[PDB]
Structure 1
C-alpha cells in the first residue's frame, strides 16, 4: 500500500504552499498515485473487477477536478498535467 511518508512525500511536493493539504493539484496528484498503483495491480490481477470499479471512480473524480482547474487556470493545468504525465 501507499505508506504514510510515501503519500506525505507527494502531498508536500505538490502543495501550493507549505501548509496546503488539499488544493486542486494536491488532490489530483494524490489520486494519480493510487490510480497508477491500482492500474499496475489490475494488470496482474485482471479478473478483479470490483477493485477496477473504484479505479473508474478515482479516474472519473480526477477528471472532474482537472476540468475545474483548466477552467479557472489554464496555466497550472498544463503545468499540473505535464508534471504528472496525464491526458493521453
Structure 2
C-alpha cells in the first residue's frame, strides 16, 4: 500500500508551495502514483477486472485535471507532465 510518508513526499515534492495539499499538480502526482501502483497490481491478477475499473477511472480523473491544467496555464502543464513522465 501507499504509506503516508511515500505519500507526503510526493506532495511536498510537487506542492506549489508550503502547506499546499491540493494544487492540481499535487492532485495529478498523487493520482499518477496510485495509478501506477494499481497498474502494477494489474500486471498480475489480470483477472481482477474490478480494480481495473478504479484504474480506468483514475486514468480518467487524471486526464481531466490535466486538460484543465493546460487551458489555464500551458507551462505548468508541460512542466508537470515532463516531471511525471505522463503520456507515452
TM-score range, shorter chain: over 0.9
Point out 4+ residue stretches in structure 1 off by more than 3 angstroms. none
Separation in 1 of the partners of 2:66 and 2:75?
12
TM-score by length of 1: 0.98
What is the TM-score when the length of structure 2 is the normalising length?
Answer: 0.98
CA separation in 1, counterparts of 2:28 and 2:3? 18
Aligned length, in residue pairs: 88
- Inter-partner Cα distance in structure 2 for 1:36 and 1:68: 21
Structure 2 portions without partners, runs of 5+: none
* Structure 1: runs of 5+ lacking an equivalent: none
Secondary structure (helix, strand or coil) at the match of 1:44 reads coil
